[PDB]
Design a protein around this motif. Structure first.
Motif, PDB file in Angstrom:
ATOM      1  N   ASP A  59       0.829  -1.330   0.085  1.00  0.00           N
ATOM      2  CA  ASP A  59      -0.128   0.103   0.046  1.00  0.00           C
ATOM      3  C   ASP A  59       0.759   1.364   0.079  1.00  0.00           C
ATOM      4  O   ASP A  59       0.646   2.165  -0.620  1.00  0.00           O
ATOM      5  N   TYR A  85      -7.816  -4.009  -0.967  1.00  0.00           N
ATOM      6  CA  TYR A  85      -7.511  -2.609  -1.630  1.00  0.00           C
ATOM      7  C   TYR A  85      -8.182  -2.349  -2.842  1.00  0.00           C
ATOM      8  O   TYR A  85      -8.635  -3.129  -3.648  1.00  0.00           O
ATOM      9  N   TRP A  87      -6.136  -0.344  -5.127  1.00  0.00           N
ATOM     10  CA  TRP A  87      -4.915   0.182  -6.217  1.00  0.00           C
ATOM     11  C   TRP A  87      -5.034   0.114  -7.570  1.00  0.00           C
ATOM     12  O   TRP A  87      -5.502  -0.799  -8.131  1.00  0.00           O
TER      13      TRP A  87
END
Ligand SMILES: CSC[C@H]1O[C@@H](n2cnc3c(N)ncnc32)[C@H](O)[C@@H]1O
Ligand SMILES: Nc1ncnc2c1ncn2[C@@H]1O[C@H](CO)[C@@H](O)[C@H]1O
Ligand SMILES: NC(=[NH2+])NCCC[C@H](N)C(=O)O
Ligand SMILES: O=S([O-])[O-]
Ligand SMILES: O=S([O-])[O-]
Ligand SMILES: [Cl-]
Ligand SMILES: [Cl-]
Ligand SMILES: [Cl-]
Ligand SMILES: [Zn+2]
Ligand SMILES: [Zn+2]
Ligand SMILES: [Zn+2]
Ligand SMILES: [Zn+2]
Ligand SMILES: [Zn+2]
Ligand SMILES: [Zn+2]
Ligand SMILES: [Zn+2]
Length: 269
Positions: A59, A85, A87
């Protein structure tokens, strides 16, 4: 806080840390910040990471790098990373980092799973990379930065220092991981040399087979009568560079001298 996030995720996803694959998750934020900072991660970097675990280092890398590739052996952990997550710039690769084909990157920033320390490092040293910031079992790190003539100077030490400046940036206590392992860690910087020394793998293996031997003695035990008679071999060994050293006392540059000397006398090609 990062500790708190770990315990939150373990129970949210029902994660059972598996010791078969050495699952020890980094929970000290200072360690992640030091890695990132040593790596000097910028918006143009393509980063390789191994064993992202709960994604805490991943991260931090994703928010600073152009792209991160991260290799994870545990399929369940991958599924959790995908759910937890969001991303835009991380590609998760499933597999053993020692076995799968690596993408192109300019930097590695990673925890290294204790059990693959050696094969990961030898694979890394055969790659083009600008910088590596890697967390190793302390004992393996000490081996990597060991100086010629020290007790733990070995083929790894030599090959790694041949490629780069290698140093320990910080020691990391076992209390920095959950679950707590039985070994400490160290953060290692590898800065590839402008003056890269490229060493014949076969010469190095032959020399380091018995690294406590004198250079003439290890050569005596390695050189065959392949286009060279007994008396020619005796002449070659008599005049070898660094005849007064034992193998474990050789710098990369000194191995290189022996290599160039053997090449000029026909023994390597
Ligand atoms: C943080 S502990 C190591 C992390 O890397 C993973 N891992 C362990 N061994 C390997 C390996 N050989 N290749 C890739 N990931 C690994 C574990 O599943 C965990 O997420
Ligand atoms: N005469 C030779 N010609 C070519 N290669 C050799 C010769 N003698 C030994 N080697 C190889 O080179 C290694 C390093 O000296 C040896 O272990 C061996 O594999
Ligand atoms: N060790 C031997 N093979 N001796 C026989 C004579 C060798 C010869 N004097 C040479 O140096 O080439
Ligand atoms: O430990 S893995 O199976 O989530
Ligand atoms: O022992 S070597 O450096 O001449
Ligand atoms: Cl372990
Ligand atoms: Cl974030
Ligand atoms: Cl022989
Ligand atoms: Zn807490
Ligand atoms: Zn363990
Ligand atoms: Zn700082
Ligand atoms: Zn995030
Ligand atoms: Zn050990
Ligand atoms: Zn020995
Ligand atoms: Zn022989």
């Amino acid at each position: 806080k990062m500790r708190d996030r770990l315990f939150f995720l373990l129970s949210k996803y029902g994660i059972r840390p598996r010791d078969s694959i050495g699952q020890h998750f980094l929970i000290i934020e200072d360690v992640i910040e030091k890695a990132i900072e040593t790596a000097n991660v910028n918006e143009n970097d393509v980063i390789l990471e191994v064993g992202p675990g709960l994604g805490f280092l991943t991260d931090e890398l994703a928010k600073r790098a152009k792209k991160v590739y991260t290799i994870e052996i545990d399929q369940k952990i991958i599924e959790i990373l995908k759910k937890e997550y969001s991303w835009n710039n991380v590609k998760i690769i499933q597999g053993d980092a020692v076995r799968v084909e690596w993408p192109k990157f300019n930097k590695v920033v990673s925890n290294i799973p204790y059990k693959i320390s050696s094969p990961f490092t030898f694979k890394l040293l055969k790659t083009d990379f600008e910088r590596a910031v890697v967390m190793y079992q302390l004992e393996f790190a000490l081996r990597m930065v060991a100086k010629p003539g020290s007790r733990n100077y070995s083929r790894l030490s030599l090959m790694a220092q041949a490629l780069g400046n290698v140093e320990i940036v910080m020691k990391i206590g076992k209390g920095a991981f959950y679950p707590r392992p039985k070994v400490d860690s160290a953060l290692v910087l590898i800065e590839p040399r402008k003056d890269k020394i490229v060493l014949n793998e076969n010469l190095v293996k032959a020399l380091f087979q018995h690294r406590r031997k004198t250079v003439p003695r290890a050569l005596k035990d390695s050189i065959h009568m392949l286009g060279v008679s007994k008396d020619e071999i005796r002449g070659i060994i008599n005049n070898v560079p660094h005849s007064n050293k034992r193998v474990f006392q050789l710098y990369p540059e000194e191995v290189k001298d022996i290599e160039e000397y053997l090449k000029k006398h026909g023994i390597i090609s």
